[PDB]
Each structure stands twice: as C-alpha cells, then as structure tokens.
C-alpha cells in the first residue's frame, strides 16, 4: 500500500550570511546566483574601529615583548653571576620570576591581539559553506550590523535535497498497530518516490527521519526523506508528492468489488461455492481499495471459489452451475 503525501523540497544546508559588526557596506564581491566556495569573500564592510582596535592590541603586544626582552637580558646576565655568587640567590629568583611574568604577559597580549584580529576578520564576510548564493539583501552603501544581525545573503546546498512531508497521526498509529499485529510488514527499505506537480519528473529517495511529536495545530507527524539531485532539477520549496510505502502485504487477497455484499448492520459478506455446488455465506472484513477490487483482511483463504456474478439472484444454499 502506497500513500501519496504532501511535502516540500528543502536544502540540506542553509547558511544565512549575516553581518556581525556595525558599519557601511563598501563593496559587494560576489555576483548573485554564482556558486561560491567556503572562505570566499562576499561582502566588505569598512573597518574604521576594528582596525584601530587591532592597532591598539598590537601596540600592547609590542610593549609586552619589550618587557620580555628586558627580562630575558637580565636573566641571561644573572645566570653566570649566580654560579660565582656575584649576586644573591634572592635576586636571581626575582629575575626568574620577572621573566616568567613577562612571558605570561606576552602570551596574554598575543591572546588579545588574536581576539581583535578575529573581530576585524568578522568584517570580511566570507561564505561559511559551499553552494549557490541567492540575491543580496543589501546593496553597497547600506548600513548593516546596528542593533540586529542584518541578513546579507543566503547560501544553499542543492545536492542532495530533503523532502519534508507530512502524514496524519491516526494513519501512522493504524500503520504501527497493523505492523505490530503482523498484518503488514515494515517497508523502511523501500525507496520513496518523488513527483513534481504538473511534470513527469520522478526521483527516488530514502526516508531519513520520522518525528515522534504530533503537531498540535494539524494533528500530523512530520517526516523527512533525502533525494539525490545531480541535475539541480529539484528546487527548494517546490510542492511535491511523495509516494511512501505503507508496508507489504505478503498474502493480500483482492476480490472484485461487485462480489462483496453488505448487510443492514454494515457487516460485509461474500458468496462462496461450497461442496456440491452449494452457495455458502462467509463473513469477511474489507481492507483498503485498489481500483475495482476490495482487499480482504479476513474471512478468505487462497483457493476459495468466490462467486462474482448473479449475486442478487442467488440465495444461500442454492445450487448453481459454475462457469
């Protein structure tokens, strides 16, 4: 049994290129729609303050390096003198402590310089992921980064793609109950088939994820499958139908629809050709409907001779001539 569920195409990776630092967008480096590589510069925001902060950090690092050089020279001079007792051991230990303190201060200054460098590099906006970049949300000369992280662009990966489709919760519960009963065998290994509306474009994919939470507004569970898209035909957002298998019947009995009678209580029955060409009444339960044939879940076995004609003109136990 296959269910045609509604879904939408999504990209596997979405990167919303946003400005982190306030400033004026001087130049745009990319052309809209081109494929971009990771690390490619897309926007340039003018560093007025970040350059100055980097300069200040570099100056502090230079001061720390100067103090470290002084300490190193002092220790180098004191090292041979302490062996000949020219200076007190206390002075040598003080010099060593000063040298270690200077090394620590240089490391701290280097950390500050690296922090300022990262803050400045947050002005050369680069593509975090590879993919196709969309339209630029801002133009050159616009102010970005004040208050909120202004959205600059969007980058999407078009291969492979996801199909996020949705299924009613009650149908899922019924499928699980049928699988538990042994009625239907699990079809996790069967590939989902994807069709674009209005076209003959069909793709194969695999089911990845089934949500455990039911949407409170719609009473449905969401499912996510993955589909290969080497040609780029499947575009994100496109409304698509996903045929997903609802499991496998190993012993599906299909009977012509015009062979099933229903009584006043709604119970379904069939006329069977018993021994001696006698017509017997056997109650059955109808499952799903495929075309013009009823699926029978119970009340029938392989080899049974059902009557598919003259039903209104035959009474139970009457003799008939089988054709």
């Amino acid at each position: 049994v296959f269910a045609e569920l509604p879904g939408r195409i999504e990209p596997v990776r979405v990167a919303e290129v946003r400005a982190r630092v306030a400033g004026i967008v001087l130049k745009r480096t990319f052309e809209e729609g081109a494929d971009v590589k990771a690390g490619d510069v897309l926007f340039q925001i003018d560093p007025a303050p970040f350059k100055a902060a980097l300069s200040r950090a570099q100056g502090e690092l230079a001061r720390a390096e100067a103090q470290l050089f002084q300490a190193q020279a002092m220790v180098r001079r004191y090292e041979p003198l302490v062996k000949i007792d020219a200076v007190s051991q206390q002075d040598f230990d003080n010099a060593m402590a000063a040298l270690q303190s200077a090394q620590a201060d240089k490391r701290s200054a280097q950390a500050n310089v690296e922090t300022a460098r990262l803050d400045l590099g947050y002005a050369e906006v680069r593509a975090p992921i590879a993919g196709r970049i969309g339209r630029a949300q801002v133009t050159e000369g616009a102010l970005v980064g004040q208050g909120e992280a202004t959205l600059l662009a969007r980058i999407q990966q078009l291969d492979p793609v996801y199909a996020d489709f949705t299924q009613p919760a009650a149908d899922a519960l019924r499928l699980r109950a049928a699988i538990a009963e042994g009625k239907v065998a699990g079809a996790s290994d069967q590939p989902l088939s994807l069709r674009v509306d209005g076209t003959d474009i069909e793709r194969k994919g695999t089911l990845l994820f089934t949500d455990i939470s039911v949407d409170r507004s719609t009473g449905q569970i969401a499912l996510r499958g993955q589909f290969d898209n080497p040609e780029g035909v499947l575009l994100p957002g496109m409304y698509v139908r996903v045929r997903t298998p609802q499991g496998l019947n190993q012993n599906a009995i299909l009977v012509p629809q015009r062979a099933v009678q229903r009584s006043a209580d709604g119970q379904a029955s069939v006329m069977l050709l018993g021994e001696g060409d006698t017509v017997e009444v056997r109650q059955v339960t109808t499952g799903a409907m495929q075309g013009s044939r009823w699926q029978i879940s119970e009340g029938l076995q392989a080899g049974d001779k059902v009557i598919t004609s003259s039903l209104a003109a035959i009474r139970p136990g009457a003799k008939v001539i089988p054709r």
Partner: protein, 149 residues
C-alpha cells in the same frame, strides 16, 4: 479530515416513498394471462386482511378507476331498465305490452354472452357497450313487431 473523521459502512434507502403523508412501499404487478384483475384484487384483499394490524393498503390509478367502474355498472343497468320501461308504458298506454316486449332483453344478452365466451374475450368496456347496443337494437326489433301487433 482523517484526523477527526472515521468511516463506517451502514445500509440505507436510496429512494424514499411516501403516500398520503405516510411512509409507503409501492407494489406493482400484472395479472397472469387468462386471469382477470378482479379476482386478483379480491385475493389481494384476502391477503391484506391477514397482515398485522396497522399495516394498510390502497389502490391507485388504474385499480382505483376499475374499482369505481365495477361498482357503478349495476346501477347503470338498473337505471337503463327502468327508463326504457317507463318510456315503453308511455308510448303504448299500457303496462302489459311493455312487460311483453321487455321479455326480449335476455335473448340478446344471451347471444352476446355466448359469442364472447365462445371466442374467449374478457368482459371489457368494448364488450359492455356492444352488449348495450345489442340491447337497444333487440328492443327496436321487438317494437317493430309489437307496434303492428
């Protein structure tokens, strides 16, 4: 809709029939060849008399009209006989001569009945009015003798 709708198969009427404001079942049929309708409806009244109390029946259309006609035929005959007798006594200034000639009616009825039974046709309206015409012409034949007599 599957989130809050379930489907259950029941049975119900695809056509509903009401007659005179009560729910009714319409029954139609035809008499067997060689069987008149009148005996059929008599048997049907007998059958309906055996039905559970409160279950009724009524005739409609052709059956209704047939019931009325089968009712009215006898008074038709009586009125015809009395009017011919009264105009018979008026013309001859006597009662005996009228009784004399009205004795001719049964022989014409005799012939009509024997012919229709011999060929096997039913007592239709056509045979009825043919009998009436035979009746009148037999009366004319009897007058043609009795006047000169």
């Amino acid at each position: 809709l599957s989130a809050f709708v379930t489907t259950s198969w029941e049975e119900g009427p695809v056509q509903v029939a009401r007659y005179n404001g009560y729910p009714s079942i319409r029954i139609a049929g035809d008499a067997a060849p060689g069987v008149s309708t009148g005996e059929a409806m008599l048997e049907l009244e007998r059958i309906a008399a055996e039905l559970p109390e409160g279950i009724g029946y009524e005739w409609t259309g052709l059956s209704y009209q047939e019931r009325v006609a089968s009712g009215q035929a006898t008074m038709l005959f009586a009125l015809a006989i009395t009017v011919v007798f009264l105009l018979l006594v008026a013309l001859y200034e006597s009662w005996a001569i009228p009784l004399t000639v009205m004795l001719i009616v049964p022989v014409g009825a005799l012939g009509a009945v024997l012919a229709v039974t011999a060929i096997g046709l039913p007592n239709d309206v056509y045979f009825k009015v043919g009998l009436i015409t035979v009746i009148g012409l037999a009366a004319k034949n009897a007058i043609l003798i009795v006047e000169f007599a």
